A paper describes a structure:
The conserved N-terminus of Cbl family proteins contains a substrate tyrosine kinase-binding domain (TKBD), a linker helix region (LHR) and a RING domain. Phosphorylation of a conserved residue (Tyr371) on the linker helix region (LHR) between the substrate-binding and RING domains is required to ubiquitinate PTKs, thereby flagging them for degradation.
Tyr371 is on the LH, and, in the unphosphorylated state, Tyr371 and several other residues from the LH, including Tyr368, bind to the TKBD, limiting movement between the RING and TKBD to rotation about LL2. In the native state, Trp258, Ala262, Val263, and Met274 form a hydrophobic pocket around the aromatic ring of Tyr371 and the side chain of Ser227 forms a hydrogen bond with the hydroxyl group of Tyr371. In contrast, when Tyr371 is substituted with Phe, the UbcH5B–Ub binding affinity is comparable to wild-type (N-Cbl Y371F, 84 μM) and the LHR-TKBD interaction is unperturbed, as demonstrated by the crystallographic structure of N-Cbl Y371F. Notably, N-Cbl Y371F appears slightly more compact and less flexible than wild-type N-Cbl, with an Rg of 2.38 nm, a Dmax of 7.67 nm, and an Rflex of approximately 56 %. Thus, in solution, it appears as though Cbl Y371F mimics the behaviour of native Cbl. Cbl Y368F is slightly more flexible than native Cbl but retains the ability to ubiquitinate receptor PTKs, whereas Cbl Y371F cannot ubiquitinate receptor PTKs but is able to maintain the native conformation in solution. For Cbl Y371F, neither the number of foci nor the relative cell density are significantly different than in cells infected with wild-type Cbl; these results suggest this mutant may potentiate transformation but not to the same extent as the other Cbl Y371 mutants or Cbl70Z.
Author numbering: 47 to 356, 360 to 435
């Protein structure tokens, strides 16, 4: 895997994508129009795929041999069947908002959003431009070329080992946490589009992982992907506390941050740092007295050490908590399909049985997360009532 793409497969994905549309059109659901919107993202993906097939009408063989497209269509079918099955098992819970199956539909919608953004970035106007994809940051670009050359997409394991040579990765828990941020399409593959977005968010390249640890992993202000209405909702509690701020990612504008803050008048405003790294904007904003309380907390981090040449560490408890951020606690964070049903001793990490088995059968060393020895295992129930 992944195998070549036949026209019979593309017709199969379309039959699947349509089934998801029919399910989400249900008035009993009453989805949110705010991005990501799956009822718009799917027909756009379909309409763009036709554009791709339109340009490769006379040259279909070369399209099926394209490594990126084989991966994309593989993930498209997997993420679509995952959504269809989500409606199947969830049953009545889908209708009640803020339910665990319903929340997973939001996570999947965000991934479908990331997929279309990647497809339009790699196939502009329906033509493959992957090998000539320009990585914005220079220092990040020369790294990719040295390690992967003209490759559009690479396996996570290959990407992890490569990045490890320049920016050290102390443990597998840091690796899994790193993957949760950079692997937008969630297909165990890293593309130039994904790599570009990440290296733009956590610039400079010289202190890449040292920036990501201090801005996302251990920073209360980090909110990942949120809607502006969701930013107003959380900051509304601290509307009587000028200086209260949070920063988020936007699915409609990848690669840049959006900082929400509380004024003295009692308003919630929102700015976008443009040409300076996030920590440089937070430091300056801290001196100005606008960015004072991350998530309303009186303990604001000192990021001034990032400008200096060199030097902080992160607990493994913080890495594990970061992995549980972008989704619900129910989901296994390895496959992001099945729910947890087994606990590993003595590290206490949770997962599903299929992943643990797949890791052991693949001659893996110990726990899939921390790679520590497995003394014993015990089963857990994640959905006790339903
Ligand atoms: Ca990916
Ligand atoms: Zn799993
Ligand atoms: Zn473990």
């Amino acid at each position: 895997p992944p195998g070549t793409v036949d026209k019979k497969m593309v017709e199969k994905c379309w039959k699947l994508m349509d089934k998801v549309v029919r399910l989400c059109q249900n008035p009993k659901l009453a989805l949110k129009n705010s991005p990501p919107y799956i009822l718009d993202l799917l027909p756009d993906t379909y309409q763009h795929l036709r554009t791709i097939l339109s340009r490769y009408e006379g040259k279909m063989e070369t399209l099926g041999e394209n490594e990126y497209f084989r991966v994309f269509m593989e993930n498209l079918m997997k993420k679509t069947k995952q959504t269809i099955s989500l409606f199947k098992e969830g049953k009545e819970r889908m209708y009640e908002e803020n339910s665990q199956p319903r929340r997973n539909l939001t996570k999947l919608s965000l991934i479908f959003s990331h997929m279309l953004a990647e497809l339009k970035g790699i196939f502009p106007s329906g033509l493959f431009q992957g090998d000539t994809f320009r990585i914005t940051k220079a220092d990040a670009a020369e790294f990719w070329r040295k390690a992967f050359g003209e490759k559009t997409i690479v396996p996570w394991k290959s990407f992890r080992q490569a990045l490890h040579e320049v920016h050290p990765i102390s443990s597998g828990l840091e690796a899994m946490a790193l993957k949760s941020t950079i692997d937008l399409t969630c297909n165990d593959y890293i593309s130039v589009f994904e790599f570009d977005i990440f290296t733009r968010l956590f610039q400079p390249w010289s202190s890449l992982l040292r920036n990501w640890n201090s801005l996302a992993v251990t920073h209360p202000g980090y909110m990942a992907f949120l809607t502006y209405d969701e930013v107003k909702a959380r900051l509304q509690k601290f509307i009587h506390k000028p200086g209260s701020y949070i920063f988020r990612l936007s699915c409609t504008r990848l690669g840049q941050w959006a900082i929400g803050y509380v004024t003295a008048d009692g308003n919630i405003l929102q700015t976008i740092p443009h040409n300076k790294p996030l920590f440089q904007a937070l430091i300056d904003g801290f001196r100005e007295g606008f960015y004072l309380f991350p998530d309303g907390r009186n303990q604001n981090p000192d990021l001034t050490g990032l400008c200096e040449p060199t030097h902080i560490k992160v607990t493994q408890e913080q890495y594990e908590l970061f992995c549980e951020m972008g989704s619900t606690f129910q989901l296994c964070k390895i496959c992001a399909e099945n729910d947890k049903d087994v606990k590993i001793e003595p590290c206490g990490h949770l997962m599903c049985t299929s992943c643990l088995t797949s890791w052991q059968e693949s001659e893996g060393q110990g726990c899939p997360f921390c790679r520590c020895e497995i003394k014993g295992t015990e089963p857990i129930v994640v959905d006790p009532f339903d």
